[PDB]
Design a protein around this ligand. Structure first.
Ligand SMILES: *[B]([O])([O])C1=[C]C2=C([C]=[C]C([C]N([C]=O)[C]=O)=[C]2)S1
Ligand SMILES: *[B]([O])([O])C1=[C]C2=C([C]=[C]C([C]N([C]=O)[C]=O)=[C]2)S1
Lengths: 358, 347
């Protein structure tokens, strides 16, 4: 790699691993559109299996960016509209509180207080209907953003209905394959299991457990090479050959809501570039990231702005991930670790790197 | 031309010309993405000059589609946002009625009752300022559509301000040139004058007269070949090399408002295809958020000047479209009926 990149990465990430006690880490820096890779430590501590470019990490909520792009792809195909009522795609969801709640609201956490998590007792589709039928809004739709798996997870599930495909088959077929993400999985198949890293929580080896709407909200596992291609594709969607996917990516980076200096896309979140680092860093702390915030409607949505910092944090019990890129600079980073360490440490490190390189 | 295209076009347009007494006409059918041209009658009755593939016609309000695309291109460039207040790009617009009137409302005729025409007495930029300051809205923004040159025209003027180019300069360099529309003009140059058809109103040869915001609302003159290429560009924006222009086209075909069967885009108006050939202040329903360009639509615009009548319709899903240009302003329903006869037969 260029020495500038080797220098800043080693000075920033290597001490981060020390400080946070991360067992294993992979990083990709996209620079002038080209990926550069860095690896540390172990995917499996007991078996002393090192992190490689073939190591699968759990993405956690970085999966929401795949869901937002799949959803945008179904819009470009004319299969769904974000202006459509939720109940048009789930006819059994008839309770009156759902009435003005659209696909847009579900995709952007603005339905009016759907909870962060689907309760773990909710297992069957029957359980799920009852949950949603019984849910009472804390706010009117399109007034507050409350980051929620039960919001975007439902969006994902309903977005694929017109196509008749299961969520996983739509995702493999319409997103993973055209982009040649050949090692990215919702369900890791047998042949890939020796590459699937352990996550570590309080020194125990953990994998993410099943849960309602997991695939849709936090269920993607991927490699650093595939993640770098993910960033490449989102950096320049016009280079993508599949027309609906190309439009899908730009739809997921449109700005539908503003809260402070932050804009909500579909999965992706954006700020104008140049950004105030304190904002992104402190903003990624769960005290702020998980709190209700008032939103201003952007009427109509601003299309993908090139001068943007586009980003997303992800975590499962054993993993912590981060993706950020600036389309105007052809610059990005991906950070995959098999320990869930604080979000502000991730963003701070990513900012130090991308700021040094822009 | 395939005999099928040849037969439907001539069976339809011949009676049209005779019934409406149209002096000259040009038509382009776009079929499976390829253009076929047809010409009839006179560009200039007194000089016995025929309509050719190089004759320039006034487009009238079909110019609004160019204005909507150029505004869409300015959005894609990050120069403007449709969500921005009008007063952001015209600070001197301090009158309080302008509060929540955005560029969206201007583009889509939903500002609250801006008039069809800018008064003929408005003949300077401070004249124009006073006009908009003194304008009293009948309705809240985003609630009724009233088709208006003073509405879309203003949008076109504001959309180009960040660039610093005049409206004509920006249209040329950002829309005409990239699409190779080398015989499309806001102002017809002396080199092209011999191709500029006369319009005919009650038997008198007329050209469009000067007026405030003419360029932005009704000022484009074009040939059937450039108009065909305009349709090809709108049928498949993704084939366009210029990134912001490609996005600008798609933004212009997005659905922002609904009234009855019709959706309002930027300049373009759309209905779901297939469409009954058969589908004014009108209340609008906001489409929140706007639906991105729908392939399965009938996308269209009528245009008129004192002496010209034009129509463009296309269906992206079918790779199908038509342009009809005439140097007589004749009833819109006659245009649409002929266009539908032609396109229904070919789909
Ligand atoms: B994301 O921001 O990385 C998230 C992924 C999850 C969140 C909350 C809950 C769960 C799953 N779960 C129980 O519901 C785990 O115990 C995943 S936020
Ligand atoms: B379009 O639908 O073809 C139109 C072009 C014009 C219309 C109305 C009036 C004028 C001329 N004008 C300026 O606004 C003068 O009153 C052009 S509709």
């Amino acid at each position: 790699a260029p020495q500038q990149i080797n220098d800043i990465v080693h000075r920033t990430i290597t001490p981060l691993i020390e400080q946070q006690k991360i067992p294993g880490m992979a990083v990709a820096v996209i620079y002038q559109g080209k990926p550069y890779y860095f690896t540390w430590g172990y995917a499996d501590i007991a078996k002393k299996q090192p992190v490689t470019q073939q190591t699968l990490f759990e993405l956690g909520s970085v999966s929401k960016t795949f869901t937002g792009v799949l959803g945008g792809d179904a819009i470009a195909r004319g299969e769904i509209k974000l202006s459509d009522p939720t109940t048009k795609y789930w006819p059994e969801l008839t309770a009156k509180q759902w009435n003005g709640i659209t696909l847009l609201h579900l995709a952007t956490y603005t339905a009016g207080g759907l909870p962060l998590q689907v309760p773990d007792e909710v297992k069957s589709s029957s359980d799920l209907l009852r949950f949603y039928q019984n849910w009472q809004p804390a706010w009117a739709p399109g007034t507050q953003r409350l980051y929620a798996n039960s919001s975007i997870g439902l969006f994902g599930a309903l977005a694929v209905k017109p196509s008749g495909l299961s969520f996983e088959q739509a995702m493999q077929t319409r997103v993973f394959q055209p982009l040649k993400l050949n090692h990215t999985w919702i369900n890791v198949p047998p042949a890939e299991e020796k590459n699937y890293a352990w996550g570590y929580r309080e020194g125990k080896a953990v994998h993410v457990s099943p849960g309602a709407l997991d695939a849709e909200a936090y269920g993607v596992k991927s490699t650093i090479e595939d993640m770098a291609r993910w960033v490449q594709s989102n950096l320049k969607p016009l280079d993508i050959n599949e027309k609906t996917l190309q439009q899908g990516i730009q739809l997921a980076q449109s700005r539908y809501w503003q809260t402070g200096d932050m804009y909500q896309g579909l999965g992706w979140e954006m700020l104008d570039w140049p950004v105030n680092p304190d904002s992104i860093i402190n903003g990624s702390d769960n005290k702020i990231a998980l709190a209700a915030r008032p939103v201003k409607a952007i009427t109509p949505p601003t299309p993908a702005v090139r001068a943007s910092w586009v980003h997303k944090t992800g975590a499962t019990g054993g993993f912590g991930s981060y993706v950020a890129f600036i389309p105007e600079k052809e610059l990005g980073i991906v950070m995959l670790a098999n320990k869930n360490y604080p979000n502000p440490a991730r963003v701070d490190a990513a900012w130090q790197i991308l700021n040094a390189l822009q």
